[PDB]
Design an enzyme around this catalytic site. Sequence first.
Site, PDB file in Angstrom:
ATOM      1  N   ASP A 186      33.331  48.795  47.236  1.00  0.00           N
ATOM      2  CA  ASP A 186      34.576  48.014  46.490  1.00  0.00           C
ATOM      3  C   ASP A 186      35.653  49.148  46.372  1.00  0.00           C
ATOM      4  O   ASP A 186      36.153  49.431  45.150  1.00  0.00           O
ATOM      5  CB  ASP A 186      34.273  47.049  45.117  1.00  0.00           C
ATOM      6  N   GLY A 187      35.981  49.765  47.537  1.00  0.00           N
ATOM      7  CA  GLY A 187      36.788  50.756  47.494  1.00  0.00           C
ATOM      8  C   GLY A 187      36.164  51.956  47.692  1.00  0.00           C
ATOM      9  O   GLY A 187      34.929  52.198  47.616  1.00  0.00           O
TER      10      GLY A 187
ATOM     11  N   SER B 226      41.078  51.433  44.792  1.00  0.00           N
ATOM     12  CA  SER B 226      40.038  50.579  44.113  1.00  0.00           C
ATOM     13  C   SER B 226      40.280  49.086  44.507  1.00  0.00           C
ATOM     14  O   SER B 226      41.489  48.616  44.014  1.00  0.00           O
ATOM     15  CB  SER B 226      39.799  50.909  42.323  1.00  0.00           C
ATOM     16  N   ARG B 227      39.449  48.432  44.771  1.00  0.00           N
ATOM     17  CA  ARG B 227      39.555  46.693  44.997  1.00  0.00           C
ATOM     18  C   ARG B 227      39.659  45.807  43.737  1.00  0.00           C
ATOM     19  O   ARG B 227      40.063  44.857  43.718  1.00  0.00           O
ATOM     20  CB  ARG B 227      38.864  46.365  45.908  1.00  0.00           C
ATOM     21  N   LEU B 228      39.169  46.554  42.612  1.00  0.00           N
ATOM     22  CA  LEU B 228      39.069  45.579  41.326  1.00  0.00           C
ATOM     23  C   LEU B 228      40.341  45.795  40.707  1.00  0.00           C
ATOM     24  O   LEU B 228      40.744  44.734  40.292  1.00  0.00           O
ATOM     25  CB  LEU B 228      38.039  46.289  40.456  1.00  0.00           C
TER      26      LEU B 228
END
Lengths: 147, 143, 528
Positions: free
Chosen positions: C318-319, C343-345
């Site tokens: 996730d990144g 960071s995809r969050l």
Amino acid sequence: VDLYESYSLVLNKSAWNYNEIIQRDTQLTILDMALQVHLFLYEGKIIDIAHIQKIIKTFVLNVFAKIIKGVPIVLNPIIIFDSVRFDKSKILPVAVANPKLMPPLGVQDWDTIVDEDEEIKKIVSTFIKLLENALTVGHEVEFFQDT
Amino acid sequence: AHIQKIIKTFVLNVFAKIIKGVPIVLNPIIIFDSVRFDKSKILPVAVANPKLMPPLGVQDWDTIVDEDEEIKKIVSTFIKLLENALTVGHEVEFFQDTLLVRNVDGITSLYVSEKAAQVFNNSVIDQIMPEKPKYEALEDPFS
Amino acid sequence: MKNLKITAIKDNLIFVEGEHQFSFLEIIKFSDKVEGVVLKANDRSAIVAILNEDKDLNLTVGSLAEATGELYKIPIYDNYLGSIINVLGESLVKQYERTNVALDKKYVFTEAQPIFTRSAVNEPLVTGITVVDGVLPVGRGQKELIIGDRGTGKTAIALNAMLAQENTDVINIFIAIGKKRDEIVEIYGTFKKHNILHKSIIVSAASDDAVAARYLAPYAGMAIAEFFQQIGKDVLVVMDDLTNHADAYRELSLLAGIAPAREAYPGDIFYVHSSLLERGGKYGPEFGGGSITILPIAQTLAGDISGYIPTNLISITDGQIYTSAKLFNEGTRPAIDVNLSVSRLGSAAQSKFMAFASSGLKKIYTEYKYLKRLSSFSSKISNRDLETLQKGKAFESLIDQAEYEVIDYETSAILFLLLKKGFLNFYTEKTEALKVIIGVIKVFLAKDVLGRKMRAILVEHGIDSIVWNLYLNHMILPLLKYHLLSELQYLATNREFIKKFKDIRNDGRILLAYERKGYERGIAYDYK
Ligand SMILES: Nc1ncnc2c1ncn2[C@@H]1O[C@H](COP(=O)(O)OP(=O)(O)OP(=O)(O)O)[C@@H](O)[C@H]1O
Ligand SMILES: [Mg+2]
């Protein structure tokens, strides 16, 4: 005798140190501690800063009156206010070293010489805590007038 | 020569610390202080530990010594030997052209020559500090 | 009883004969300690990859072996915490004694829990690094790859992230695949020094250990993490590094006779890594209710982020966090290239104050790089571009941070807030002064009781509250104003400086007090 055995030499050294710190202009006055207390207490009830300054000055004057009668006052396990008197009735307020193992005799808490109101005791406790923190970090706080 | 340079550096650090009104404690018996009568007039003294009025801002010798183990060991040995020499009755020199003596009982005194007082007064009036000690090779005591 | 016999030993593989009902990864016991795993099997023969060695066993042709009939399960013991163990559960270095009663047995290839058992990531994982915690947030249950070149500080980033959990409830697990033993021992000493040993495990497979051990180490570590997560604990897992794991799998496959593929890796290396890494995440209360955060590490060649394994791993996690060798050569630590990291969050993995403090700074930094790399005809720069350049240069000075230094979350939030509000732009000419003021502010917020009070009220009352505004206006901003006046006098007449520092007193006694305190251990004449 030694330079400590006389009032004039010790007074001259103390005055020189105080004058040097004053001319550096790095010391924290009573207003600074009042503002710090106001900010620290700003989430239970707002207390006027001028009120805090007046309360702090009355408390320190009470300490002065108690120390001029030869009774040491303990504000913290670290700081103990005492007096040393030389000949000719001269006296000088002092803060002693090693207050941990050689405490002065007949020490009384500050709580004795403070009004029983909850607000006054809380204000003085916060002031004492801030004074301890300021001394720890390395500030120069004023306690009596011109000291 | 290394030890001599280190000792001179330590005594110069003490000298610089005491002209600013900071007493230095080398041992429970000897405390180095200064007495100033007026601007431009100061005099180094050695006093015993007072009994009822603790001195203002006393610092240990350990504060003014480098944290290296060798330097600290050399300075500790010098202090111990100085204490023993004063106890037995010697007259040890501490600053340049001064002398440290222990009189009757536990009273210590520091006797200052003319040029030592001159350098003290120069330091206090014009901020002319003595130059840093340097490594000097030992000179033959004879001829 | 023994029911198999060794017939050949080729390609570091053991061929056994004997009628049995073999299964994949079934444990074959050659002695009381030495074990292997079945890879392929006929109805009367099997091929086995050994997991460990013994000096006295002398395993050769004709040696007897027993097919235990069970799968490769790792056992859980109370003394795993604060110890280094191998893939079979043997304490290489231990801190406490072991009771010989297994708390559980966890299957190595346990399948990941399905979609309905998951939950959204909503809690931060404090890594102790300002730029990571503010611009590249990592949440609990998020997989963030650490991609970088050789010797750029990836292991240091993972170690900082785990040392930041000294005062939390998160259990650290460090899986080492093909590392140096004298580095694992050093990491063990670092764990012991910072008082995180009692909550940390190390799983070690050395560079010259068995290929099966190096291949199966991350799965054993994940089984341990799953055991810890099944009792609702947050687990932070650091795999160092998956390049060595891919190399071990490729070696095993090529020695087993499998055909090669792109870059000689087997065709299912992606499935290997994806099925390994899909076992970490946030889970609902009905299925353990914990989280497993993974920080895999991977190495590029000459900064080539488009390699096969780096891009295979980017498509799983996730990144990523990219560490630059050019930045590292310039003495910039950590050498994190923010423009190449993500960071995809996003803000969903941050606190509200942290999310507000750094709302649009990463985009501003990307724009700052784009303008810096752009060549134009009109040498006149618009006000917006000037603001972008100044804010990007100011942001570049918050990245620097010493090794093994843990900065509190609220300190990072306050620094990012100061950057966002525009107070740090005036340092665009002096950067050493900016470093000094950041150090002073960090010391004030960490040591002084008023700094901890400021952080505490920031946590409970938020940024928009009146109390925090008063704290900012009476404690931090005066110091910045005094420092800016001291270092740059001409700012006394600047229009924007007057506009912002209007009702702010020029108080700078904190910096002077700290300078006095630092210099109080000062000597007129040096000894050296
Ligand atoms: N923030 C930092 N400040 C100063 N030095 C640092 C910092 N981070 C790492 N270092 C140092 O930089 C060096 C390289 O870092 P490190 O060994 O963690 O990188 P790596 O990518 O894991 O390298 P390798 O390819 O050898 O595995 C080490 O000496 C480490 O102590
Ligand atoms: Mg490494």
